[PDB]
Write a protein that binds this DNA or RNA. Structure first.
Ligand SMILES: [Mg+2]
Ligand SMILES: [Mg+2]
Ligand SMILES: [Zn+2]
Ligand SMILES: [Zn+2]
Ligand SMILES: [Zn+2]
Ligand SMILES: [Zn+2]
Lengths: 162, 162
DNA sequence: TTGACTCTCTTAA
DNA sequence: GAGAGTCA
DNA sequence: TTGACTCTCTTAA
DNA sequence: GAGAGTCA
């Protein structure tokens, strides 16, 4: 809601509720052949999810509170960042999972960044493999690696140079 | 169905036409602070584009040939790969620009890979910066770097551990 | 047979 | 990665 | 007021 | 990153 006090209240109620989600240990690649452990606070798979939470998509949730007798609703991972700018360089800020685990609502696993920055973490070599993200990755991105390219650059004739 | 000879003739006519596209010299980051040069064969900004070519979107084109009274049409960057498998690991193969220049139709700047592999090249450190793509990048990805994250992981209380 | 437009679609964050 | 509506 | 569903949308490859 | 229709 409009007031800073009301926004802090939303963040605090969200943190209390999410803090009661099951804590699931995930062992993750860090890059550089190293492994670490993350503690994700995972929203339940089915209703009930927790006070204020409802599922709007297979892996999409929303947080809802009644303030000033009106319903205020946010994407469930956006709540930690309600006091932050909602854009950067003209690009919309998104909640971005450092653990790449959409059910996780641990704010220590979330950052607030452009969708491009968000996506790019999928391929990051990780905090022990050369991550250069200013807000550092918690793990190597799940899509990091050589890829599975079927065909490389090629020509039949002699019309082209690299 | 088109024979492999007919497909080869399509690829040859496409190469002949694209080989007359304006060749533009671009200086690009390779990673590791090194700069290099790519030579892109750029489809024109407006019609006419070249024999067989037509624009179906802001940065989308198609190549069309009529063979024995039947009209055949392909995505304009897919033609080099018509003799290749069209899927891998259950994922559709996509034309993927190693030069990240959609107007370019230089087949020496294209590969054929999943959309995930394609996207991930946007953040690659580049052939002189640590690229691990089996079909190596030609340049550092345009989105490589520290990013512009607005807010990092944070909590107000003590409900969470990382 | 061809050019130059038109429209909607896929994927996974 | 999002916002918003329909019910009970 | 709160819960549990429904729908479509955004972005840039 | 795609496929397909209309019209002359
Ligand atoms: Mg993400
Ligand atoms: Mg690409
Ligand atoms: Zn997590
Ligand atoms: Zn990183
Ligand atoms: Zn090129
Ligand atoms: Zn690469």
């Amino acid at each position: 809601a409009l007031t800073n006090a009301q926004i802090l209240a939303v963040i605090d109620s969200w943190e209390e509720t999410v803090g009661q989600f099951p804590v699931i240990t995930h062992h993750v690649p860090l890059g550089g052949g190293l492994q670490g452990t993350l503690h994700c606070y995972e929203i339940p798979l089915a209703a009930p999810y927790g006070v204020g939470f409802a599922k709007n998509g297979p892996t999409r949730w929303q947080y809802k509170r009644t303030i000033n007798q009106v319903v205020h609703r946010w994407g469930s991972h956006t709540v930690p960042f309600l006091l932050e700018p909602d854009n950067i360089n003209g690009k919309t800020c998104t909640a971005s999972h450092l653990c790449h685990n959409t059910r996780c609502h641990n704010p220590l696993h979330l950052c607030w960044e452009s969708l491009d920055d968000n996506k790019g973490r999928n391929w990051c070599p990780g905090p022990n493999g050369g991550c250069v993200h200013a807000v550092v990755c918690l793990r190597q991105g799940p899509l990091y690696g050589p890829g599975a390219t079927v065909a490389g650059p090629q020509q039949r004739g002699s019309h082209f140079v690299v």
